[PDB]
Design a binder for this molecule. Structure first.
Ligand code: HEM
Ligand code: HEM
Ligand SMILES: c1ccc2[nH]ncc2c1
Ligand SMILES: c1ccc2[nH]ncc2c1
Lengths: 137, 137
């Protein structure tokens, strides 16, 4: 279930974070404008940049903290507020996050492993609604 | 305290994992008997070896999960048994683990941060006790 999936992801966090983020960027090419240092580069070129692996892992580490503090796949309002108020998120709307979670669930369903894809779909939808309640447009 | 320290380490885990493992290898040079590929290499050279970085991060990913599952710095018996039974740990003894935790605690005390170094000292001692209970020599 959802708690075991957090343990599966954390055990190899660097690899899962890179592969899910690449799946997102390739599914939604217009989303790459939030990341100007990544434009015009193949997947393997991206993986050779120190900050691509480091920052992508740090994003997924915070995602796993929020997931583990959730109740029945509903995140804490305080965690949603942190994501709204981060200076690095100043340009964003809930649609950016909606798309990330569509790509994450698609990756889990295609992987050939027993992820609880339905719980991750709920988590993404409940995170989007919490972001709106915490003040994201 | 201990729970916040797990969050701090997870926020920059590859960097902390490599720096603590180097501290261990440099404090106890005879411990390289179990790491023959790491002989004859300076710290900067080890940090550009793919397996050194990838394996060290995976070790610390699992260490943080064992710490997070503990109660009052006492690990689960199921986590201790996993660590005894892993094929990659055949022929380790509890002294290998004792020395890794001495180095980890020394690193925290020298860091200039606010780590709860006494809780990590207790965790290392309690993990050693649990590994003995689960059958490590
Ligand atoms: C639950 C989902 C998300 C979490 C937990 C999260 C978390 C983070 C964290 C921890 C950082 C700092 C990384 C660092 O400096 O090392 C970061 C930076 C950033 N985030 Fe997010 N974020 C999420 C979703 C998104 C989405 C959907 C976008 C845009 C599509 C986005 C855009 C950015 C940008 C532009 C930065 C700064 C640039 C960079 O680090 O390279 N975030 N985020
Ligand atoms: C709580 C402490 C520890 C945890 C959580 C842990 C976990 C792990 C994990 C997850 C791996 C697999 C790495 C991979 O294949 O990518 C591994 C391999 C290994 N472990 Fe540990 N371990 C710990 C302590 C130690 C200690 C103290 C030693 C020896 C001083 C050690 C020696 C090894 C060896 C020799 C391998 C295989 C060779 C290699 O990966 O280069 N372990 N361990
Ligand atoms: C969201 C997901 C993965 C990432 N890597 N770098 C910035 C970033 C934002
Ligand atoms: C213990 C700590 C760090 C490590 N890196 N690779 C194997 C290993 C064992």
């Amino acid at each position: 279930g959802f708690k075991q999936d957090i343990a599966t992801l954390r055990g190899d966090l660097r690899t899962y974070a890179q592969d899910i983020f690449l799946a997102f960027l390739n599914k939604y090419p217009d989303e790459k404008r939030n990341f100007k240092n990544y434009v015009g580069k193949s997947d393997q070129e991206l993986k050779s940049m120190a900050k691509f692996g480091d920052h992508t892992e740090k994003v997924f580490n915070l995602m796993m903290e929020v997931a583990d503090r959730a109740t029945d796949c509903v995140p804490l309002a305080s965690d949603a507020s942190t994501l709204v108020q981060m200076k690095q998120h100043s340009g964003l709307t809930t649609g950016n996050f909606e798309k990330l979670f569509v790509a994450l669930v698609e990756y889990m369903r295609a992987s050939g492993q027993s992820f609880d894809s339905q719980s991750w779909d709920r988590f993404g939808k409940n995170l989007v609604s919490a972001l709106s309640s915490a003040g994201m447009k």
